[PDB]
Design a protein around this ligand. Sequence first.
Ligand code: NDP
Ligand code: 52V
Length: 157
Amino acid sequence: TLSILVAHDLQRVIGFENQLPWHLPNDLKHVKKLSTGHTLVMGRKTFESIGKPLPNRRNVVLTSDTSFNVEGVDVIHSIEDIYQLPGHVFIFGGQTLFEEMIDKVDDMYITVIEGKFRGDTFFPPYTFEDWEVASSVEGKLDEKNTIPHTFLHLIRK
Ligand SMILES: NC(=O)C1=CN([C@@H]2O[C@H](COP(=O)(O)OP(=O)(O)OC[C@H]3O[C@@H](n4cnc5c(N)ncnc54)[C@H](OP(=O)(O)O)[C@@H]3O)[C@@H](O)[C@H]2O)C=CC1
Ligand SMILES: COc1cc(-c2c(C)cccc2C)cc([C@H](C)C#Cc2c(C)nc(N)nc2N)c1
């Protein structure tokens, strides 16, 4: 399987100044559970906004930088290399990678953040005419998770 994994708001904002605009522990747990034991593919900027690979899964970074070498990170230099990675692969961000991959993935795991944030990076537009709703699960609000959010699993029709 080739999947997208993304959290976006009502206007498809995914980022602001190389950070996420929201803090939602429930969504981070969601990411952890889906991707532990599998593969994350991300653009260079997304990786550098964290600077350390996520434990207990393969972290793949796409960059043109032939000098890129980070301990615990595998590097690729072409979109075409993504198709050679084994197992379940998750396109993890950012805007550029989403734009390049949205037409290619089998399915999408989307956390819809039910708010409107200031952003400078966006998930590309998509229509539910192209995607079946495999599941739609309301996130639980509480002390530490105070923005309404819905976990969607979308599969290409
Ligand atoms: N809300 C969410 O779920 C998520 C949000 N984000 C956010 O997204 C933002 C970053 O997005 P964006 O600026 O688009 O950056 P990206 O993370 O997509 O990185 C862009 C870089 O990736 C590399 N790259 C992309 N395509 C190719 C290619 N075909 N060949 C070689 N290298 C390639 C290039 O690296 P190089 O220049 O080194 O060659 C390029 O400059 C941040 O704000 C981050 O917070 C990210 C993931 C998820
Ligand atoms: C090391 O590469 C990364 C690690 C993390 C990271 C996570 C997910 C949890 C705890 C700590 C860290 C550092 C995040 C990212 C990017 C910003 C992303 C993302 C994302 C999120 C947050 N939610 C949904 N649904 N999809 C997503 N792609 C990259």
